[PDB]
Amino acid sequence: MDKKTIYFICTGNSCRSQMAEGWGKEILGEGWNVYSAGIETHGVNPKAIEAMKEVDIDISNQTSDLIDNDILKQSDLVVTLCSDADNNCPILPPNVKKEHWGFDDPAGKEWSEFQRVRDEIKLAIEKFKLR
Ligand code: NA
């Protein structure tokens, strides 16, 4: 079996989707190619980078990307991580499955909020692996 493809989407491919990609590559790596994108590109959020450093994962060289239809077409699961991404997700290929895993936006808050959301994302990906 070829590896499956999971595509994490948030508003700016900045924070939630970047943490999801960082965790995903570690947790899902044996079975999955992991990509992330956004409605816009805001760059990788500095507090998200710091949050991932605390769990020994470097996301500082991950890319902030717009949604790519070729990746959409080849996705086994598209995961929207916020309301903007979910409400503005482009029309998907008819055979491509999408789920919304909503997480709070730590935007503009203390580092603790990034730690909180980081770890909610970690658990969601761990559960997903074992579905
Ligand atoms: Na990306």
- List the binding residues for K(+): 13, 36, 63, 65
Q: Do residues 76 and 99 touch, judged by C-beta distance below 8 A? A: no
Give the method used: X-ray
* Number of C-beta neighbours around residue 76 at 10 A: 14
Distance CA 122, CA 120 (A): 5
Distance 24 CA to ligand 1 centre (A): 12
* Angle of CA points 100, 38, 130, to nearest 5°: 40
Dump the DSSP string for 7-50.
EEEETTSSSHHHHHHHHHHHHSTTTEEEEEEESS-----HHHHH
Distance CA 115, CA 106 (A): 9
Residue 15 appears among annotated catalytic residues = no
Q: Do residues 103 and 120 touch, judged by C-beta distance below 8 A? A: yes
Domains of the chain: 1-131 (3.40.50.2300)
Query: Is the alpha carbon torsion for 53, 59, 7, 24 positive or negative?
Result: negative
Q: Do residues 33 and 4 touch, judged by C-beta distance below 8 A? A: yes
Distance 63 CA to ligand 1 centre (A): 4
Q: For residue 50, give Cα distances in angstroms to 9, 33, 46, 57, 97.
A: 20, 24, 6, 9, 32
Among candidate residues 27, 89, 92, 107, the one labeled active-site is 89
